[PDB]
Design a protein around this ligand. Structure first.
Ligand code: STI
Length: 295
């Protein structure tokens, strides 16, 4: 827990960014942020330009369980300090409504960003795609070593900062744009390892599987939904085929930009056995070294 609340009186409402069962996320401008610049709030103020933040707000009539989960997220976010994980800027928890505040990325989520680019034969290069993926692996290494499981890794849950910096986040199913990526609890089945779908087992190994699918998205420049040839019920059936291990399971195809070795990395992320999936330390090393060294 942060020692002092961010002053709610400085948050100027701009836009509603999303909603869920227990609250909303708003885009706010911080009024006169130079007044707040301190050790507690080391805000990056650009004179002449508004300071924008995302604010997650718990409904004041939230249940006890909803409130506890919100405070659990506060506690988790207060620990996360890595260049490739979204940073908590402040909280409002002394009074209702409870709030968490992070930076707002004008470049949007990584899906939005890659969707707006084309592959260099605006453009983005294959080496930059590897850098994006390496950053995600590095953030995931950090999370896993702190004994967190993400459970919803995908390009839609990564934010694009300045100079191609990628921040892993977790927004939940709070945005209409990605409703088709979730199956009705509400689950991102196309990113989920077979054991998640069949047994509800979520682990770092299943985060690795999701990382494989996220890497696939990146190399596809977010042009195709994973398993777009399959209905939701068929995706669940595909998980059964991984369980069966009789060679009928469908794997995502190799993207045109993806060399065979990188594709085989992805296939290893989709190993039937968790213990055969590469750790994030290895995924990062492969992307930052092996793949980048073989352009
Ligand atoms: C305002 C806020 C409050 C909380 C969070 N929280 C997280 O992003 C997050 C990240 C990692 C974890 C780790 N956790 C481990 C356990 N498992 C099960 C889940 C994940 C938890 C929360 C983000 C935000 N930021 C946010 N939220 C929604 C939209 C945007 C946003 C949208 C567009 C551009 N810029 C920002 N930004």
């Amino acid at each position: 827990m942060p020692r002092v609340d961010f002053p709610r009186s400085r948050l100027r409402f701009k836009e509603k960014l999303g909603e869920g069962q227990f609250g909303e996320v708003h885009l706010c401008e911080v009024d006169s942020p130079q007044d707040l610049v301190s050790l507690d709030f080391p805000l990056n103020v650009r004179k002449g330009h508004p300071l924008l933040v995302a604010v997650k707000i718990l409904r004041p009539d939230a249940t006890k369980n909803a409130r506890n989960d919100f405070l659990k997220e506060v506690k988790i976010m207060s620990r996360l300090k890595d260049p490739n994980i979204i940073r908590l800027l402040g909280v409002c928890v002394q009074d209702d409504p409870l709030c968490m505040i992070t930076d707002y990325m004008e470049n949007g989520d990584l899906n939005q960003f890659l969707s707006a680019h084309q592959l260099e034969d605006p453009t983005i290069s294959y080496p930059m795609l590897l850098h994006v993926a390496a950053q995600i692996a590095s953030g995931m290494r950090y999370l896993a070593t702190l004994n967190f499981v993400h459970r919803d890794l995908a390009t839609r849950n990564c934010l694009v900062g300045e100079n191609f910096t990628i921040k892993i986040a977790d927004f939940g199913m709070s945005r209409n744009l990605y409703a088709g990526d979730y199956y009705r609890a509400v689950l991102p089945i196309r990113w989920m390892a077979w054991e998640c779908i069949l047994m509800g087992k979520f682990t770092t190994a299943s985060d690795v599987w999701a990382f494989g699918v996220t890497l696939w998205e990146v190399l596809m420049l977010c042009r195709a939904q994973p398993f777009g040839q399959l209905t939701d019920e068929q995706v669940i059936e595909n998980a059964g085929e991984f369980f069966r291990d009789q060679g009928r399971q469908v794997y995502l195809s190799r993207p045109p930009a993806c060399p065979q070795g990188l594709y085989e990395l992805m296939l290893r992320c989709w190993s039937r056995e968790s213990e055969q999936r590469p750790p994030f330390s290895q995924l990062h090393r492969f992307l930052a070294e092996d793949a980048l060294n073989t352009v």
